[PDB]
């Protein structure tokens, strides 16, 4: 078969792969990005389509504009399970036309010299002499099977992790996703019968019964159009997400016009710390394939962008040292853990605690304002549940006279702080990965056991 040589092969062109291509462009390298989808569909995986402005600012990434920006968001309304307490959290963000924005990023990367092949699937890794060395591709437009050799593969295949899962199972970058570390999620976009109230505010409904392990949402995409959906925890034996959706849609979106459904669909969403290493010999893994998603709220487009940025920085470093080993690419880990990964690890612990609370606990916590809106904001953006904030909360929790997991909040905060510091001490080279991973696994197991 035909053989081509590139410096970098990016497999997948969603927020993660497109970010990597954009960030790597015009830096002297010969880059190819492939995606199984036709051009006009790249970017269209089901999603709530909400991304903070702070994520774009973190990276100085261009804002969505024109038809890419369906609706400007000025904050979130968070609802207690009993619907009696609503916390309004202010902050700027965007409700995107995700395919349009994602396609605009790709078009700009292409304009800056990135080669992009759509309708093209990476079928098989080239793994030789202990390194990822490229991929066998199938290009549906040309009905050609081709081999592309690359110094580095950027695996950005989304939740399917379709390329890295075909690698030798002893490699650390083949790390699999436990069922309980992901949610399944489903959404629809519908027009509404009436103008949406406060259409610049997203609505998130906490309820352990109608969306066990996740939450329901109502995300306006304009004055009369909404993205509504839910996520539920995987691996718990829950019935189909579609049973919850049918049963409770009317509670959260009484105003949708069901005769005016525009799109619908679901996908898996990882909800955990990132891959223990996102780099290995000849390969970096980013976005959902590397578990980049916020474990508490399931937001992965902003962090997908961050992982793309870190991949680019690590690759440029590798070319400047001629070193495509895991050691040569290791700054990918150092970058990503400092930008977002350490926060994710802390939030992985926090999510485990939140998933085990009852509706009565959450109604009580929110009613009594056990933490303020300012502190919930600080905790979601940095991963920090300050010990003083946990103390103040525990002073309110001490006035509860029934058994509750809420009483463990201080212990949770301590475990969050511990895991965060462990991640901020991420191993400086691959020879230490094993030792450190065992310390993490130890923190997690101890923590899982502390909740009984
Ligand atoms: C229902 C629902 C709701 C939400 C969310 C998820 C879900 C399922 N999330 C998460 C967010 O959608 C997700 O984390 C990012 O879109 C993932 O971006 P990636 O680029 O990693 O994967 P993504 O899945 O977008 O892209 C991967 C690409 O790889 C291609 N591909 C896969 N295998 C391939 C192969 N072998 N060869 C070639 N191409 C291949 C695919 O065609 C695809 O285009 C979210 N996040 C958020 O920020 N805001 C939100 O509101 C929500 N809400
Ligand atoms: C202000 C907008 C913040 C982005 C919301 C992300 C949560 C989506 C799963």
What is the DSSP annotation of 149-215? E-SEEEE--GGG-TTGGGS-TTSGGG----GGGEEEEEEEEEEESSPPTTTTEEEEE--TTTSTTS-
Coil vs helix vs strand at 451: coil
CA distances to 85, 90, 142, 181, 214 from 368, rounded to whole Å, are 9, 20, 63, 30, 22
- Ligand 1 centroid–CA 101 distance in Å is 13
DSSP 154: E
Coil vs helix vs strand at 155: strand
Alpha helices by DSSP H, listed for 87-155, are 98-111
Alpha helices by DSSP H, listed for 183-257, are 241-252
- Ligand 2 centroid–CA 405 distance in Å is 27
- Ligand 2 centroid–CA 95 distance in Å is 9
Is 259 marked as binding a ligand?
A: no
Q: Which two structure tokens, joined as six digits, stand for 253?
A: 């979106």
Which ligand has an atom closest to residue 71 CA?
A: 2
User: Over the Cα atoms of the chain, what is R_g?
Assistant: 22
CA-nearest residue for atom 3, ligand 2, is: 52
Is 255 marked as binding a ligand?
A: no
Please report the DSSP string for 252-278 in residue order. Answer: H-TTEEEEEEEEEEEEEEE-SS--S-S
Is 22 marked as binding a ligand?
A: no
d(CA 443, CA 305): 28
Q: Are strands 69-79 and 201-205 parallel, antiparallel or unpaired?
A: parallel
Quick check: 234 and 159 in contact, CB under 8 A?
Answer: no
Residue environment code for 205-232, b if the CB has 16+ CB neighbours within 10 A, otherwise e: bbbbebbbbbbbbbbbbeebbbbbbbbb
- Ligand 1 centroid–CA 393 distance in Å is 36
Task: Enumerate the β-bridge partners of residue 11.
Answer: 34, 155
SS (H, E, C) 406-445: HHHHHHHHHHHHHHHHHHHCCCCCHHHHHHHHHHHHHHHH
435-441 long-range CB contacts below 8 Å, 24 or more apart? Answer: 437/276, 440/273, 440/276, 440/345
End-to-end CA distance of the chain: 58
Q: Are strands 115-117 and 31-34 parallel, antiparallel or unpaired?
A: parallel
Residue from 70, 89, 93, 267 whose mutation best tests the ligand 2 pocket (most atoms within 8 A of CB): 93
Helix (H) or strand (E) holding 365: helix 359-367
Domain ranges of the chain: 1-452
Angle at 268 between CA 356 and CA 121, to 5 degrees: 160
Q: Report the pocket of ligand 2 as residue ranges, CB < 6 Å.
A: 48, 50-52, 73, 91, 93, 297-299
Name the one residue in this structure whose structure tokens are 């487009």: 301
Name the one residue in this structure whose structure tokens are 């400086």: 428
CA-nearest residue for atom 10, ligand 1, is: 300
Quick check: 163 and 171 in contact, CB under 8 A?
Answer: no
- Ligand 2 centroid–CA 140 distance in Å is 35
Helix (H) or strand (E) holding 75: strand 69-79
d(CA 290, CA 178): 13
Nearest-CA neighbor of 326 among 339, 337, 314?
A: 314
Which ligand has an atom closest to residue 202 CA?
A: 2
DSSP 44: -
Angle at 112 between CA 110 and CA 118, to 5 degrees: 10
Is 297 marked as binding a ligand?
A: yes
Residues in the chain: 452
Out of 3.40.50.2300, 3.40.50.20, 3.50.50.60, 3.10.20.30, which CATH number does the structure's domain 1-452 have? Answer: 3.50.50.60
Residue from 49, 55, 71, 76 whose mutation best tests the ligand 2 pocket (most atoms within 8 A of CB): 76
Task: Enumerate the β-bridge partners of residue 72.
Answer: 94
d(CA 208, CA 386): 25
- Ligand 2 centroid–CA 252 distance in Å is 18
Nearest-CA neighbor of 309 among 16, 11, 5, 76?
A: 16
Quick check: 295 and 226 in contact, CB under 8 A?
Answer: no
- Positive or negative, the CA dihedral 423, 425, 430, 435 is negative
Using the atom order of ligand 2, give the atom closest to the CA of residue 94.
Answer: 2
Coil vs helix vs strand at 284: strand
d(CA 437, CA 426): 9
Technique behind the model? X-ray
Is 176 marked as binding a ligand?
A: no
Nearest-CA neighbor of 278 among 295, 292, 293?
A: 292
Is 54 marked as binding a ligand?
A: no
d(CA 149, CA 390): 52
Name the one residue in this structure whose structure tokens are 């906490």: 206
What's this structure's resolution in Å?
1.8
d(CA 108, CA 121): 22
Name the one residue in this structure whose structure tokens are 């995107």: 96
Measured in degrees and rounded to the nearest 5, phi and psi for residue 276 equal -55, -35
Chain CA centroid to CA 156, Å: 12
Residues 6+ apart with CB under 8 A from 253: 190, 218, 226, 228
Residues 6+ apart with CB under 8 A from 85: 79, 363, 366, 367
Give me the sheet containing 131-139, strands edge to edge. Answer: 2-5, 144-149, 131-139, 120-128
Quick check: 183 and 231 in contact, CB under 8 A?
Answer: yes
Q: Are strands 182-192 and 256-270 parallel, antiparallel or unpaired?
A: antiparallel
Quick check: 9 and 32 in contact, CB under 8 A?
Answer: yes
């Amino acid at each position: 078969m035909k053989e081509l040589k590139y410096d970098v092969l990016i497999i997948g062109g969603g927020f993660a792969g497109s970010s990597a291509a954009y960030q790597l462009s015009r830096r002297g390298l010969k880059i190819l990005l492939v995606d199984s989808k036709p051009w006009n569909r790249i970017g269209d995986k089901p999603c709530g389509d909400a991304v903070s402005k702070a994520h774009f600012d973190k990276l100085g990434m261009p804002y969505p504009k024109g038809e890419e920006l369906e609706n400007k968001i000025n904050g979130i309304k968070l609802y207690s399970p009993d619907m009696q307490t609503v916390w309004t959290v202010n902050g700027e963000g965007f409700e995107l036309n995700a395919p349009l924005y994602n396609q605009r990023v790709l078009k700009e990367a292409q304009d800056r010299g990135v080669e992009i092949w759509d309708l093209t699937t990476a079928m098989k890794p080239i793994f030789e002499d202990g390194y990822v060395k490229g991929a066998v591709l199938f290009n549906r437009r040309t009905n050609e099977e081709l081999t592309v050799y690359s110094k580095v593969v950027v695996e950005a295949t989304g939740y399917s992790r379709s390329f890295r899962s075909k690698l030798p199972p002893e490699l650390p970058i083949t790390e699999d996703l436990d069922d309980k570390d992901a949610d399944v999620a489903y959404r629809e976009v519908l027009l509404t019968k009436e103008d949406i109230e406060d259409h610049d505010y997203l609505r998130i409904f906490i309820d352990q019964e109608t969306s066990p392990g996740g939450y329901w949402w109502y995300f306006p995409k304009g004055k009369n159009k909404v993205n509504v959906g839910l996520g539920i925890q995987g691996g718990m034996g829950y019935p189909s997400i579609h049973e919850y959706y049918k049963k409770y849609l009317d509670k959260y979106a009484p105003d949708v016009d069901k005769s005016k459904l525009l799109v619908k669909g679901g996908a898996l969403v990882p909800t955990r710390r990132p891959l223990y290493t996102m780099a290995w010999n000849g390969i970096i893994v980013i976005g959902d394939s590397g578990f980049t998603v916020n474990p508490v709220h399931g937001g992965g487009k902003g962090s997908a962008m961050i992982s793309g940025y870190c991949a680019a920085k690590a690759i440029l470093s590798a070319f400047e040292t001629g070193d495509f080993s895991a050691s040569g690419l290791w700054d990918m880990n150092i970058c990503y853990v400092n930008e977002y990964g350490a926060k994710q690890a802390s939030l992985d612990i926090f999510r485990r605690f939140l998933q085990k609370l009852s509706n009565d606990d959450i109604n009580y916590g929110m009613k009594k304002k056990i933490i303020k809106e300012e502190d919930l904001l600080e905790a979601s953006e940095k991963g920090d549940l300050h010990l003083s904030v946990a103390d103040k909360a525990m002073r309110v929790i001490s006035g509860l006279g029934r058994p509750s997991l809420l009483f463990k909040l201080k212990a949770v905060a301590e475990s969050m702080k511990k895991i965060k510091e462990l991640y901020l001490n991420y191993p400086r080279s691959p020879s230490s990965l094993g030792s450190w991973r065992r310390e993490v696994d130890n923190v997690l197991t101890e923590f899982n056991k502390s909740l009984s």
